[PDB]
Amino acid sequence: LTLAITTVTNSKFRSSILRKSFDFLMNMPNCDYLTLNKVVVNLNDAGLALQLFKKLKEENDEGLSAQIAFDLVSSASQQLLEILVTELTAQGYDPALLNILSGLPTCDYYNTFLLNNKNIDIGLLNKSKSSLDGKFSLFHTAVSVANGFMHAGTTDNSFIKANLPWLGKAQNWAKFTATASLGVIHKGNLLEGKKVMAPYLPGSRASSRFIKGGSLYGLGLIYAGFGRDTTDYLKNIIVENSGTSGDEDVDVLLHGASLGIGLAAMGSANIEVYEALKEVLYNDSATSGEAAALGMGLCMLGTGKPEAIHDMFTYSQETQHGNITRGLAVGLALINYGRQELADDLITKMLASDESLLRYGGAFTIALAYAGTGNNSA
């Protein structure tokens, strides 16, 4: 497994090698269950993936079937997680192993392990954020985002709740970090994560519509990859505002929605979210127009859609907007992931152009596709 990745160039030849090792390990004579896990993740084959669970039904072990289930959900891509949940249900499953692949105990590992022993060292933390209330949002971001690191996963709102003054000193754009910090702190909550943003959710209004946009972004960090339940929730908000906008803060509400729907659907190809964010790009929005391209690029990860490669690239030359062109440049980098030489057609167009934003995203396009095994050409 290790040598063939850095040696065999053909993807189909190394694909057959992983299939031969599955037959010798199929009988499971107390053999390695981790080797079979790396086979189904690299191949992403629904036939070999569901076949491993069928063997766990014949030989019944609750400790052996668990270690396989918890290992697959962590190492799987977004497309394979749907096979282990949606496709597995149609062909039959294990009621004990279904909740594991859905991420319920997996997200508990992030919440429970970090909550037992957590030392934030509030002594040195207070001196950093008590220095000044000024410096615009540069100071309020540094104290809020760094604080969200220590409490990440433990669901502690003490920065927002227990400390009143640091929240009020923030401006309209500075309240985004204070709200998005809860998405980092409460990350891993598949049930009460919506109750954290409950006062800022749509229909409950807010103190302002600038801070309201940050609530839709906090749902993206917590539910990322599991956000299938929040897919239709975050999509309907964009469709209502997809027509036009009469205010600046309305785009801020859709700004966090585009980044929120992008993280929940991240890695999964969705034509509905792509077409919903495509109409926002037609309006040529200065604020929400950049997040619309970032939300589409996260859905195009992996193979992606070849038609969306030239479509998003054409809109970059037609629409000359600061945030828009830079947002499309990153979106064109995310649409090509692991393609290696298959992305050279888009890389050549960016290197030949003298635009600063096209060359900014052209480097990361090489970084995403040529990652893993090193390439002397890249």
Binding site: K135, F136, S137, L138, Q171, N172, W173, A174, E248, A286, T287, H321, G322, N323, D354, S356
Partner: protein, 284 residues
């Protein structure tokens, strides 16, 4: 929030040329462009304006001469909406304009995005093209839109910011100067064919063909004497310090004539190839 102005390569050169002549002489000009608040900012065309007796002021703008240019600039696409004005002043430590002070407030009534650009160097440019603009603040900078989220803010580090006399406060209530320049495909190839290092163009095949061959009478004529000049440069150095120490006060003396005579041999090797490159059509 504060605007980020992107000035095209064509408009940046016109504003420097109009406010060029003289230190004391002040002029005025108008800026055109089409952009939207917060991002999308741009400057398309700029042109000079007629000056009144008060110099830079709000009443110095003549709408009669301005309306006639709108139909003239519309054919080539130069006609846009007025995005502000640019001016030239001798310059001081603070308030570069000795005339215009509060007139910018009258400019804000007509356009909220209009600014006044003043050229600091006045033919002092060292190549960085440092220009100064202004934006009205009045009551603000407390619980309002957050300007310093864009680029290069918190100016005034130590005693050196821009002019270095302004430091933090700048002109009025920290207007937070933001200026950027950009170029297009047509602007990139045109400048390289006009001014890059020195302009030899207009004949591409005759550049090194005319200069390194037909110009030998004014350049390499009496090449036997020219070879003696290469010896005098080496004799000026090699003859001094042969001990590789400090006696005659020299160090790089062997490398002083090394790089100077390297091009002389190189140029003689280039014309040597171009000598056979004349292509006299000899053969047999």
């Amino acid at each position: 929030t504060k605007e980020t102005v992107y000035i095209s390569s064509i408009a940046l050169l016109k504003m420097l040329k109009h406010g060029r002549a003289g230190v004391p002489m002040e002029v005025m000009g108008l800026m055109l462009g089409e952009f939207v608040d917060d991002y999308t900012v741009n400057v398309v065309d700029v042109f000079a304006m007629p000056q009144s007796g008060t110099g830079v002021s709000v009443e110095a703008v003549d709408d009669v001469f301005q309306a006639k240019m709108m139909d003239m600039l519309k054919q080539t696409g130069r006609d846009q909406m007025v995005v502000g004005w640019y001016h030239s002043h001798p310059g001081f430590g603070c308030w570069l304009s000795s005339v215009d002070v509060n007139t910018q407030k009258s400019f804000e009534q007509l356009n909220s995005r209009a600014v006044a650009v003043v050229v600091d160097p006045i033919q002092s440019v060292k190549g960085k093209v440092v220009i100064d603009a202004f934006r009205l603040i009045d009551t603000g900078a407390l619980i309002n839109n957050l300007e310093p989220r864009q680029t290069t803010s918190n100016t005034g580090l130590l005693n050196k910011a821009n002019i270095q006399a302004l430091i933090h406060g700048l002109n009025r209530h920290y207007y937070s100067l933001n200026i950027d320049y950009h170029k297009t495909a047509k602007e990139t190839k045109m400048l390289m064919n006009l001014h890059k290092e020195q302009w030899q163009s207009g004949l591409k095949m005759y550049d090194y063909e005319e200069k390194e061959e037909s110009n030998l009478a004014a350049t390499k004529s009496m090449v036997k004497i020219a070879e003696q000049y290469s010896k005098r440069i080496e004799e000026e150095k090699e003859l001094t310090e042969e001990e590789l120490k400090t006696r005659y006060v020299g160090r790089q003396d062997p490398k002083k004539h090394l790089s100077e005579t390297a091009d002389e041999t190189l140029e003689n090797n280039i014309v040597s190839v171009l000598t056979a490159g004349v292509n006299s059509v000899a053969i047999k």
